[PDB]
Amino acid sequence: ATQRFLIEKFSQEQIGENIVCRVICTTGQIPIRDLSADISQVLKEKRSIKKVWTFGRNPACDYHLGNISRLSNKHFQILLGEDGNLLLNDISTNGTWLNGQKVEKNSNQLLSQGDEITVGVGVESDILSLVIFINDKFKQCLEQNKVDRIR
């Protein structure tokens, strides 16, 4: 009974193809998704940004939620830049929360491991939480920062 484990493990396998961060809903409302950015572009681009994700009720948004009026089309956005460091940018009409602490809108914050962002604050029964998972594999690549190079 190990072969089957491999198949099941494949779906929930440690991804590191070019993964940036993973979004996981704990309140059971939005389905898990995988956020990612290409390393070549990150190591190549010498700017203060590589790729940013937008989350909200917008079908365009990099993250499609259920349908909560309390949340905006693009409730929040996540940016990826620097030497692998990740940043979280809130962009909600009502506000974005971090572990119960409301952060400044359209503001950059230092991402946290397995962090969680809460949204739709105002009504105890109208708040939705989201958990962010950072890919350890990606961090390993950035930590070493190896420019292409062959053997």
- Give Cα separations from 77 to 61, 95, 120 (angstroms): 9, 12, 15
For CA atoms 6, 11, 17, 19, give the dihedral sign: negative
d(CA 151, CA 139): 21
d(CA 109, CA 79): 9
d(CA 75, CA 88): 12
Terminal CA-to-CA distance of the chain, rounded, Å? 39
Q: For the chain, which residues make up each domain, given as ranges?
A: 1-151
d(CA 140, CA 137): 5
Helix (H) or strand (E) holding 9: helix 3-11
CB contact set of 60 (below 8 Å; sequence gap of 6+): 54
For every residue of 28-72, DSSP letters joined together read S-S--EEEE--HHHHHH--SS-SEEEEEES-SSSSEE----TTS-
CATH (residue range 1-151): 2.60.200.20
Whether the CB-CB separation of 100 and 118 falls below 8 Å is answered with yes
Whether the CB-CB separation of 71 and 65 falls below 8 Å is answered with yes
d(CA 69, CA 90): 17
CB contact set of 126 (below 8 Å; sequence gap of 6+): 68, 70, 120
d(CA 109, CA 103): 8
